[PDB]
Amino acid sequence: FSDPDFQYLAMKEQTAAFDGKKNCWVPDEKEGFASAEIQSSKGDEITVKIVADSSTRTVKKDDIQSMNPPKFEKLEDMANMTYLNEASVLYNLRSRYTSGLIYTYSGLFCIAVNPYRRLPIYTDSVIAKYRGKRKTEIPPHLFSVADNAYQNMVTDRENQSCLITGESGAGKTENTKKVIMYLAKVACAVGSLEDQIIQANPVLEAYGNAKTTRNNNSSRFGKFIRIHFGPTGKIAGADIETYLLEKSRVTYQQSAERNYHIFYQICSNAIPELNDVMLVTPDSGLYSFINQGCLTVDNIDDVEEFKLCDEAFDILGFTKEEKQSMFKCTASILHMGEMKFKEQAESDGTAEAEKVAFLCGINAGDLLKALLKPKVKVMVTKGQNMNQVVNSVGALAKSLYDRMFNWLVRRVNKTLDTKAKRNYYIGVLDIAGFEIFDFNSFEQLCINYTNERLQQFFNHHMFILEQEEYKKEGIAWEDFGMDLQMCIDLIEKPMGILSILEEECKADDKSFQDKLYQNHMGKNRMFTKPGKPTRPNQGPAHFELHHYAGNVPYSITGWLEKNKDPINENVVALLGASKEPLVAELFKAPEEPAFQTISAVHRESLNKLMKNLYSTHPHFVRCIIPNELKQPGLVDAELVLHQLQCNGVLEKGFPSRLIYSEFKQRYSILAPNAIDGKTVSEKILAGLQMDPAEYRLGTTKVFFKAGVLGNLEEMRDERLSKIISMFQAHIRGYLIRKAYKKLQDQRIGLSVIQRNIRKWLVLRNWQWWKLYSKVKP
Amino acid sequence: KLSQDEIDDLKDVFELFDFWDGRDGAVDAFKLGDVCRCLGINPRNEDVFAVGGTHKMGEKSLPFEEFLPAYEGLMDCEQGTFADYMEAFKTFDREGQGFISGAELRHVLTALGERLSDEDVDEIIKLTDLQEDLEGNVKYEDFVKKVMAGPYP
Amino acid sequence: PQKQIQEMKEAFSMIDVDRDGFVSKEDIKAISEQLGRAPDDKELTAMLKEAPGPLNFTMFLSIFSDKLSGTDSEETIRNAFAMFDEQETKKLNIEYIKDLLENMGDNFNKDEMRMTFKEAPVEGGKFDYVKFTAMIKGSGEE
Ligand SMILES: Nc1ncnc2c1ncn2[C@@H]1O[C@H](COP(=O)(O)OP(=O)(O)NP(=O)(O)O)[C@@H](O)[C@H]1O
Ligand SMILES: [Ca+2]
Ligand SMILES: [Mg+2]
Ligand SMILES: [Mg+2]
The missing domain is CATH 1.10.238.10 (EF-hand)
Incomplete structure (x- = not known):
């Protein structure tokens, strides 16, 4: 079973000479970590020679990093490594990436560093070559993984979940798909409910996604598709619950960025019959609500895809009517983004504004009347002015694009809902991630709140793989990130932001800002005031805070409204009852007339999310953004690493595993009494007087609480200054004695000298000596 | 504490120092630690600086009875x-x-x-x-x- | 010893003018102002009390020999120095030895040093102890 279609899926040298402690990794500035062969020592400073650059430099011995040998290179599973450290992880992958593999594993973590070009890895042939294959045989592929989740759903009999994450333009969204696309090729009988589900993308991706400075296809909603099954076979059904679409986009497009794909694909002229159904001139160009930034996405065809959208939309079992009834609503925004004014009245060209009427089925004139400055209930009316009016128009634009998106999805769930016997499900999540920008307020907070919650489920499953060597290495040990829930809580707990933006909401900005600081502020480790870390192109905030990714400075400006939408009641009421089904439905009076602030639903939506995740045997996938250039094959060290910093490698509160073989060359100095004997330390341990719940001696390794292994370094430090200065004092004494004899002799000699002399100076003052000398002729 | 024949292993070598400072009955704290070395020891300078002791030459000088609690203190010193x-x-x-x-x-x-x-x-x-x-x-x-x-x- | 007492002898002729063979008060102060300056009266007498017994060559030779006693030999001096000329230069640094005698040891005193070096054989900084010795007591030279 090898090498037919394995060209970019899964020998060479064994040997070119590697040495042992002579070779290692060194911090480069361009390549992150560059390879080197050492030359000499001098304390902290270490002289080492760069391998294939060939020129030497100074280096602290604590930046130097261990490196693995050859037959251990371009490794399938990094868990099976000697040096799973920074400069090693960043290597292996690079080696594999640059070599046509994108997928790799590290413990129970998936690694696909995004290849910006298309790839043959997806052929049914391959798919076939996969299902039923145990993990350790076939080279690394999302397939292998996607498979074993069912391999596992059946036999173990429970739901599994598959969380696919990484940064933006990483590949989350692009695999989530490839995934349902796989599961698909295992069911058929003897355009297909299978082929119907596959289409649910082009729909939601059309309306939902958008081109971002980063990635031309960035999502804007949290997705979590569930895929159930029958007691036996292929699927029984599936469903979709989305999370927090960007409402903002609809009206504003950050420069060099655009609005949702559909909008632009609506003016491409694929089916001109509709130009007239749309009352729209097919030029993307000078419409407003959708062109603040690029209007063209290169290597992305608006007609072809749109057609594909229409085409798909049908297989969804959407009537010709339902089909149209969407485009329609969608076009109406293009137009309202137009309704001029001049005043509290001036509706310049009530000629376009004329137009929204035919589309919703509400006389436009009735509508421009009833809410240019028209009224509300208690009903009364009061002068709507030239600006909110403008800022009340988008109130309507967005306040719908959401009700519409909502509907669309809610409707897809309807045709994907066969009610056959359902037993288990493979839930796939394709959600956001943590983001820190030069400005982060509210929208940009929940992405974070939702993730924090996602970290609990993360290490929830680590404490667990952790007790997987409390079994492996015979030891029973008896918070470790107990402030994390002190963040979770800080935010979601009852006397918190949420419990308030919801509660304290005579509401203006500081009425709201005051409670916050006064209550769990001033005094919390996490919830603290701001300062300047110099965010660069960076700007304005009011509060700071810590997340398992670091901190991020927030603002609170106009949120009590930000958590809501000002659909001017009667505009609504008027829209409420109109003739266009979708429209009329999208604005129905309640169960009955005579609720929502964005979180009541999200906290609700989210809570629900979690609940189910814990009802599943998760599987983690990790998406790495090779580089900033959208170019395949390129590697941007400084970025890759940034990413590895918070997912599967160091920077949370657990025991510091350590092999004896190391504990020796390490702290052996804190207890100098021994003679091998792997027990060379049990002694150092006691030979220190340590309170030991604080540690556990497993077999080939040792586990300490936090700051334990920390103090050892702090002691080992202060311990060797002494031990050196001691041996220095020794040398010093050996000197003062190497010469004492010498000294004492002289002490004599001098006594001779300043004695005879002190007399040869009396002899010449003795009356008689003079006289004698007076005469020796 | 030290023995009497030891209180001598101190009188004898200090009568070499009171010498090379001038026979006066005093020596300089600076030289202190040095004497203590001649007596089979290796204290640390930080140490000798505890037991009286002085940085630079000629600062403060001491006779036997003060130069005494020195040795002993600097005696119960880690080697x-x-x-x-x-x-x-x-x-x-x-x-x-x-x-x-x-x-x-x-x-x-x-x-x-x-x-x-x-x-x-x-x-x-x-x-x-x-x-x-x-x-x-x-x-x-x-x-x-x-x-x-x-x-x- | 030899010439030493014979030298000391040939000297007695000298001192004694009456050549009575005894050196009286009125017998000293004379040859005194005969070769330079004379003493003081009492000085004279104070010089005779030092002659417990009256004045002859053997009571003389006595009080004299009664001094070059408690003094070391010569090579024991021409060597006592040597202990500080480690590299055998047969000379010391005039600020060295000098440093010695006044700051460390049996503290000489200025008056003492001044009077000590007032005629010491210093060359370009180098105090020649070999001869400061060879003469502190009397070199062999002829
Ligand atoms: N294996 C892959 N092969 C080819 N192209 C890919 C692959 N993974 C991702 N891409 C490309 O990279 C782009 C980024 O994917 P995308 O789904 O937009 O990222 P993301 O992680 O979901 N970010 P966002 O949706 O903005 O939160 C895709 O639209 C494709 O252009
Ligand atoms: Ca002295
Ligand atoms: Mg996406
Ligand atoms: Mg006479």
Whole structure:
């Protein structure tokens, strides 16, 4: 079973000479970590020679990093490594990436560093070559993984979940798909409910996604598709619950960025019959609500895809009517983004504004009347002015694009809902991630709140793989990130932001800002005031805070409204009852007339999310953004690493595993009494007087609480200054004695000298000596 | 505490110092620690600075009865054992072979701990008759036995 | 010893003018102002009380020999120095030895040093102890 279609899926040298402690990794500035062969020592400073650059430099011995040998290179599973450290992880992958593999594993973590070009890895042939294959045989592929989740759903009999994450333009969204696309090729009988589900993308991706400075296809909603099954076979059904679409986009497009794909694909002229159904001139160009930034996405065809959208939309079992009834609503925004004014009245060209009427089925004139400055209930009316009016128009634009998106999805769930016997499900999540920008307020907070919650489920499953060597290495040990829930809580707990933006909401900005600081502020480790870390192109905030990714400075400006939408009641009421089904439905009076602030639903939506995740045997996938250039094959060290910093490698509160073989060359100095004997330390341990719940001696390794292994370094430090200065004092004494004899002799000699002399100076003052000398002729 | 014949092992060597300061019945705190070395000891300068002791020459001088509580205090002082002097020179042996080049060795004690004047280091080597190979490395293991195993063996 | 007492002898002719063979008060102060300056009266007498017994060559030779006693030999001096000329230069640094005698030891005193070096053989900084010795007591030279 090898090498037919394995060209970019899964020998060479064994040997070119590697040495042992002579070779290692060194911090480069361009390549992150560059390879080197050492030359000499001098304390902290270490002289080492760069391998294939060939020129030497100074280096602290604590930046130097261990490196693995050859037959251990371009490794399938990094868990099976000697040096799973920074400069090693960043290597292996690079080696594999640059070599046509994108997928790799590290413990129970998936690694696909995004290849910006298309790839043959997806052929049914391959798919076939996969299902039923145990993990350790076939080279690394999302397939292998996607498979074993069912391999596992059946036999173990429970739901599994598959969380696919990484940064933006990483590949989350692009695999989530490839995934349902796989599961698909295992069911058929003897355009297909299978082929119907596959289409649910082009729909939601059309309306939902958008081109971002980063990635031309960035999502804007949290997705979590569930895929159930029958007691036996292929699927029984599936469903979709989305999370927090960007409402903002609809009206504003950050420069060099655009609005949702559909909008632009609506003016491409694929089916001109509709130009007239749309009352729209097919030029993307000078419409407003959708062109603040690029209007063209290169290597992305608006007609072809749109057609594909229409085409798909049908297989969804959407009537010709339902089909149209969407485009329609969608076009109406293009137009309202137009309704001029001049005043509290001036509706310049009530000629376009004329137009929204035919589309919703509400006389436009009735509508421009009833809410240019028209009224509300208690009903009364009061002068709507030239600006909110403008800022009340988008109130309507967005306040719908959401009700519409909502509907669309809610409707897809309807045709994907066969009610056959359902037993288990493979839930796939394709959600956001943590983001820190030069400005982060509210929208940009929940992405974070939702993730924090996602970290609990993360290490929830680590404490667990952790007790997987409390079994492996015979030891029973008896918070470790107990402030994390002190963040979770800080935010979601009852006397918190949420419990308030919801509660304290005579509401203006500081009425709201005051409670916050006064209550769990001033005094919390996490919830603290701001300062300047110099965010660069960076700007304005009011509060700071810590997340398992670091901190991020927030603002609170106009949120009590930000958590809501000002659909001017009667505009609504008027829209409420109109003739266009979708429209009329999208604005129905309640169960009955005579609720929502964005979180009541999200906290609700989210809570629900979690609940189910814990009802599943998760599987983690990790998406790495090779580089900033959208170019395949390129590697941007400084970025890759940034990413590895918070997912599967160091920077949370657990025991510091350590092999004896190391504990020796390490702290052996804190207890100098021994003679091998792997027990060379049990002694150092006691030979220190340590309170030991604080540690556990497993077999080939040792586990300490936090700051334990920390103090050892702090002691080992202060311990060797002494031990050196001691041996220095020794040398010093050996000197003062190497010469004492010498000294004492002289002490004599001098006594001779300043004695005879002190007399040869009396002899010449003795009356008689003079006289004698007076005469020796 | 020390014995009477010991209170003598102190009268005898201080009558050499009261000498080289001038027979007056006093000596200079600066020279203190030095005397304490002649008496088979190796206190640390930080130490001698506790027991009275003085930085630069001529600052404060002392007679026997004060120069006494010195020795004794500086007597109950921590000294080093062979291990210490090896379980600490190991953190500089990368080959683990048991060598430390001279260029380094110098730095070790000339740059770390209670730094040593290049001078001392030059003599202390002359005396201990040290030497390096063609690789320029030295077998420190020994060196620590010579210096530990005193002047005249 | 030899010439030493014979030298000391040939000297007695000298001192004694009456050549009575005894050196009286009125017998000293004379040859005194005969070779330079004379003493004081009492000085004279105070010089005769030092002659417990009256004045002859053997009571003379006595009080004299009664001094160059508690003094070391010569090579024991021409060597006591040597202990500080480690490299055998047969000379010391005039600020060295000098440093010695006044700051450390049996503290000489200025008056003492001044009077000590007032005629010491210093060359370009180098105090020649070999001869400061060879003469502190009397070199062999002829
Ligand atoms: N294996 C892959 N092969 C080819 N192209 C890919 C692959 N993974 C991702 N891409 C490309 O990279 C782009 C980024 O994917 P995308 O789904 O937009 O990222 P993301 O992680 O979901 N970010 P966002 O949706 O903005 O939160 C895709 O639209 C494709 O252009
Ligand atoms: Ca003295
Ligand atoms: Mg996406
Ligand atoms: Mg006479």
